Amino acid sequence: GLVPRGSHMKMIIAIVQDQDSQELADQLVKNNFRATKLATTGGFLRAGNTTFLCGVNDDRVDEILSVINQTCGNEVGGATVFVMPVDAFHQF
Amino acid sequence: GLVPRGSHMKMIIAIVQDQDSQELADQLVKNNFRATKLATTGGFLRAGNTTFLCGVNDDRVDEILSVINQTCGNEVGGATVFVMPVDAFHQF
Amino acid sequence: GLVPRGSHMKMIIAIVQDQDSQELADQLVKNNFRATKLATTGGFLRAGNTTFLCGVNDDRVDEILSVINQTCGNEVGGATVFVMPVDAFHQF
Ligand SMILES: Nc1ncnc2c1ncn2[C@@H]1O[C@@H]2COP(=O)(O)O[C@H]3[C@@H](O)[C@H](n4cnc5c(N)ncnc54)O[C@@H]3COP(=O)(O)O[C@H]2[C@H]1O
Ligand SMILES: Nc1ncnc2c1ncn2[C@@H]1O[C@@H]2COP(=O)(O)O[C@H]3[C@@H](O)[C@H](n4cnc5c(N)ncnc54)O[C@@H]3COP(=O)(O)O[C@H]2[C@H]1O
Ligand SMILES: Nc1ncnc2c1ncn2[C@@H]1O[C@@H]2COP(=O)(O)O[C@H]3[C@@H](O)[C@H](n4cnc5c(N)ncnc54)O[C@@H]3COP(=O)(O)O[C@H]2[C@H]1O
Ligand SMILES: [Ca+2]
Ligand SMILES: [Ca+2]
Ligand SMILES: [Ca+2]
Known part of the structure; x- marks a missing residue:
């Protein structure tokens, strides 16, 4: 795909508040x-909220979780995040 | 993550009619x-329809499929559902 | 599910330009x-763009990638595609 042999991609689905x-x-x-x-x-x-989809190399998952936690996340605010496996990644 | 050792989460993607x-x-x-x-x-x-994203513990997948089937699902209506694996689940 | 024993479904997530x-x-x-x-x-x-979700049998993934590449894909245009595993597929 667009991923070098030996690494893997993950799909991050993050549900956050609109104001963040x-x-x-x-x-x-x-x-x-x-x-x-x-x-x-x-x-x-x-009520409205925002969902981000982020395709990221396995090596950078901790890094991106850290960004989400810092910018979003809680009495108010908060972020809900799923990390999901990806078979292949392409750009055309 | 937010999941106890020994269990797993799944991601339910359900496409249903707007009126349901x-x-x-x-x-x-x-x-x-x-x-x-x-x-x-x-x-x-x-035409417009509605897609739900539902993160659920593996133990409750039959239960949630049952809810979708009862409330949505068919001459009219209908629901299309994908069950997808999840590596990790976090709340910040 | 809705898939015959011995085959598998994949979820295609394709991000393309609105004009395509x-x-x-x-x-x-x-x-x-x-x-x-x-x-x-x-x-x-x-800026606005369009995301397609396409549940497809494993056997037809090359075929659908080919369609995306022909219709979308690049100085302008372009398509970003993720292929993701699916545990089960149902229609109600
Ligand atoms: N940090 C950065 N530094 C320099 N240039 C950057 C950049 N981030 C994005 N770009 C460039 O801007 C274009 C628009 O990306 P945008 O995020 O608005 O819109 C993107 C995004 O919505 C989506 N997308 C692309 N890659 C993605 C990924 N790994 N994960 C999730 N969504 C992605 O596809 C759209 C088009 O992506 P495309 O790569 O063909 O083209 C990208 C890319 O050429
Ligand atoms: N059955 C229930 N009983 C008591 N309280 C309940 C509840 N369902 C939701 N809440 C509470 O209301 C808040 C808003 O959830 P909402 O569904 O509108 O909006 C949610 C939802 O769109 C999304 N989301 C959260 N968990 C999800 C999950 N497992 N699967 C899919 N989406 C999720 O994140 C948003 C914020 O979630 P968050 O958990 O931080 O905060 C939740 C939670 O504190
Ligand atoms: N190539 C084709 N030839 C003949 N008939 C066709 C057809 N494509 C769709 N239909 C029929 O038209 C209805 C509307 O599909 P639509 O794409 O607008 O809206 C669809 C679509 O948004 C979504 N969806 C269904 N199957 C999907 C799949 N494998 N992957 C991604 N999304 C799906 O669920 C909605 C309702 O699907 P549903 O199957 O119950 O009902 C389908 C189906 O009966
Ligand atoms: Ca703000
Ligand atoms: Ca109704
Ligand atoms: Ca066009």
Whole structure:
């Protein structure tokens, strides 16, 4: 794919508050992470929030979790993050 | 992560009709499932539909499939569901 | 699930330019692929783009990558694609 032999990619799905999405996007950019943002809404409170999709090399997962924790995360705020396996990664 | 040693999380991606999204969200809440909703659109009919993202413990996958089937699912209606593996789950 | 014993599904997540989303949706339809579309936005340029979710049988992954490459993909344009494992696939 676009990944060198011997490494792996993960997919980060991070659900954060709308009021923090701006700060996270900027800090991901500063740190050379790529991201795609989704305007979403919560099942329980039924209010808008933001979901980021971040494809990242396995080697940098701790690093990106750290960024999410610093910029988002809690009485208020908070971030919910899933790390998911990726079979292949391509750019066309 | 946020998961006890010995268990695993799965990611449920459920594509349902807009007119059923309200009923599913309420029944997931009643049953202590967390969810994130995405306004989406179908590739074929090119009309709005709703996509839910639900992170759930492996032990409760049958339970949540049952909820989706009861609230959504078909001449009309219907639900399309993917169950996907999750490496880790965090809250910050 | 909805998958015959011995095969597997993959989840394709494809991020493409808005101006190409129409052409991809039509070519996926012609080729008997199902798809769900998400209006998204890029982390870096902060402009609208489109994310497709495509559940596909393992046997057809090369085929669908080929469609994405032909319709989207680059001085301009371009497509970013993740192939992800799927545990189960259901329709209700
Ligand atoms: N396992 C999971 N799978 C998929 N998406 C997830 C998820 N956990 C969280 N999300 C998303 O993160 C948002 C904030 O979750 P949080 O747990 O920090 O904060 C939650 C939580 O404190 C509480 N909450 C949610 N469901 C609850 C429940 N059944 N009982 C009591 N409190 C609940 O209300 C707040 C707002 O939740 P809301 O649904 O509106 O919005 C949630 C949801 O969109
Ligand atoms: N493998 C998959 N991967 C990713 N997303 C999936 C998917 N299967 C379904 N979805 C999503 O679920 C929606 C309803 O699918 P359903 O199969 O029940 O009902 C479908 C199906 O009955 C039919 N349909 C879709 N594609 C077809 C095709 N190539 N040939 C004949 N009928 C098709 O039109 C209805 C509307 O489909 P639409 O695309 O507008 O919207 C679809 C799509 O957004
Ligand atoms: N690993 C990944 N994980 C999750 N989503 C991904 C991703 N790679 C790309 N995407 C999505 O695809 C869109 C186009 O990416 P592309 O790499 O072809 O083209 C990129 C790339 O040429 C450049 N770019 C992005 N980040 C950069 C950075 N940190 N430094 C230099 N150039 C960057 O700006 C263009 C626009 O990127 P933008 O973020 O606005 O929008 C991106 C993003 O939404
Ligand atoms: Ca802010
Ligand atoms: Ca209804
Ligand atoms: Ca076009």
